Design an enzyme around this catalytic site. Structure first.
Site, PDB file in Angstrom:
ATOM      1  N   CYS A   1      10.279  -9.610 -13.962  1.00 11.83           N
ATOM      2  CA  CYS A   1       9.505  -8.721 -12.796  1.00 11.83           C
ATOM      3  C   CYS A   1       8.224  -8.066 -13.739  1.00 11.83           C
ATOM      4  CB  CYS A   1      10.588  -7.375 -12.806  1.00 11.83           C
ATOM      5  SG  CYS A   1      12.152  -8.006 -11.816  1.00 11.83           S
TER       6      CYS A   1
ATOM      7  N   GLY B   1      13.822 -10.776 -16.491  1.00 16.40           N
ATOM      8  CA  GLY B   1      12.957 -10.263 -17.423  1.00 16.40           C
ATOM      9  C   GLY B   1      11.450 -10.814 -16.718  1.00 16.40           C
TER      10      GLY B   1
ATOM     11  N   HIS C   1      11.166   0.087 -10.652  1.00 16.49           N
ATOM     12  CA  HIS C   1      12.606   0.036 -11.042  1.00 16.49           C
ATOM     13  C   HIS C   1      13.030  -0.092 -12.387  1.00 16.49           C
ATOM     14  CE1 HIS C   1      12.400  -4.411 -11.789  1.00 16.49           C
ATOM     15  NE2 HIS C   1      12.014  -4.563 -10.490  1.00 16.49           N
TER      16      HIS C   1
HETATM   17 HG    HG Z   1      16.313   0.040  -8.863  1.00 16.92          HG
END
Ligand code: HG
Ligand code: HG
Lengths: 306, 306
Positions: A145, A143, A41
């Protein structure tokens, strides 16, 4: 001698954390050998969140669309591919600090250490258990992830978790290092929510054995129970049903303490039915379920106080 | 976003742990630059425990009476001296992994990370608070002496604790990195015991602010209180008296949440007098006192949920 929720020393993992940037989004990546792993993502923009087609979004990127920073050094991306919900970035440099390692998909109820990281910089480490509902009650801020979960065995780091998102109730969801999500969650903005959770019976029992090993047995009793009768009580208090497989697992701890597994189950049944009456176990006022039988053998003495 | 007792990444400290041996005793040492620090009781033998004269015991040793092992490498001792309850061993090699660091003596109520180590090998990391009675509720087994406590600020490691022994109640005592004991304890076998302890009021308040920052305020109320009236209740529940200095410290958290400090004290007073009625705060059923105002600002978001 005490009992604490302790994590594994994080040094071997700290040396693998880097920063990955695509567009205006920056998050953490895991650098092993000449590959960098991070949540896919990282390529989403505001209007892609609700219904992103990562395949379509990725084909539009080149190797230089990605920026990888290791400390104060920039790593050049020489290839990229998508593996399930993860992005695999090939870099021109092999990490000199790559430790012996492997990727493992942990099972519900098991525990691991999490190295909270921001902008590629580690900020803290703590223990947590993969809940039966496939989420973890971690501590993450924007932040975070890309932060990873792991266990360490004889200098070998077994990575088992990479952080991807936070659900409505504040709990967290992620994937294993192959990009496959733990639980029925997907990496897109939807109404998805954590399902009903249950207490990890096997761990509570492991914990009660740790208490005895450390010298405390006020909660034991003169009774025993069958698995069936035990599960009738467990079902009432939202505890996972106990199986013979779980009984077998508690074998070593049962032997070290001289307390039959079903006899300990009888103790647990009483604790659930009558409470702890203002008493504590290993310093806790409640029944802890975030310690596996393995965790107990690891932290507790091999010799019971008696 | 969650709230966990998280420790600092231990990598910088792992690279400083070594093994020190004298006679038949082996324990952990801290290797910084060309110096190795370890508990002086590494020179005691069974008949020295009750009334050891470390000065007399040490004069009888030479540099080669000490064996220092760093990983799979042997370090030669080229000098030795005693600093309070610590042994300072000079070695022929400067640690290549020495991080920026300093020695600090932490104050009661403050927190730090502990890197449990055995035979010079790190085994786990966890957070703990220096209790008002000068002990820590750690998790240590035989061979853990020499393990250190620390905090990390902008890549600088501030060492504040070295483990020396376990008291009768299972709690632990140690010294700062200058060899001075925290508390009225001494390194010899006696009947010494931990004194009465008290709850760290300032930390409980900090923790309640963290709960609000994370979106929960069910425990607040319409009342306020004076410091005096608050301390009357605190004294009854064995909580440390609150001072204006502590009120001042909570300033930033009070500002971020819009809850006056004395108003939060009113909330705490109610919680102490009426309990939590089956409710939980940040997942806990009890009032947590192992998080300082600093710890909260560090882990929680700078933006309250509201
Ligand atoms: Hg996404
Ligand atoms: Hg001694």
């Amino acid at each position: 001698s005490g009992f604490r929720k302790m994590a594994f020393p994080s040094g071997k993992v700290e040396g693998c954390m880097v920063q990955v940037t695509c567009g205006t989004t920056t998050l953490n990546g895991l650098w092993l050998d000449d590959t960098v792993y991070c949540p896919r993502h990282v390529i989403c923009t505001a209007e892609d969140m609700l219904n992103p087609n990562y395949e379509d979004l990725l084909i539009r990127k080149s190797n230089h669309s990605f920026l990888v920073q290791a400390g104060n050094v920039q790593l050049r991306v020489i290839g990229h591919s998508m593996q399930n919900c993860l992005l695999r970035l090939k870099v021109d440099t092999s990490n000199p600090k790559t430790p012996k390692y492997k990727f493992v998909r942990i099972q519900p109820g098991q525990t691991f250490s999490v190295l909270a990281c921001y902008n590629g910089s580690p900020s803290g480490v703590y223990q947590c258990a993969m809940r039966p509902n496939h989420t973890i009650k971690g501590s993450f801020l924007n932040g975070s992830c890309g932060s990873v979960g792991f266990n360490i065995d004889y200098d070998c780091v077994s990575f088992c978790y990479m952080h991807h998102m936070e659900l409505p109730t504040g709990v967290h969801a992620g994937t294993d290092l192959e990009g496959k999500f733990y639980g029925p969650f997907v990496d897109r903005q939807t109404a998805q929510a954590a399902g009903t959770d249950t207490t990890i019976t096997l761990n509570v029992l492991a914990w009660l054995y740790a208490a005895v090993i450390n010298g405390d047995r006020w909660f034991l009793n003169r009774f025993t129970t069958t698995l069936n009768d035990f599960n009738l009580v467990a079902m009432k208090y939202n505890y996972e049903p106990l199986t013979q497989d779980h009984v077998d697992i508690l074998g070593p701890l049962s032997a070290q303490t001289g307390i039959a597994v079903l006899d300990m189950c009888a103790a647990l049944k009483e604790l659930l039915q009558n409470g702890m009456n203002g008493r504590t176990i290993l310093g806790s006022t409640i029944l802890e379920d975030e310690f596996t039988p393995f965790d107990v053998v690891r932290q507790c003495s091999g010799v019971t106080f008696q």
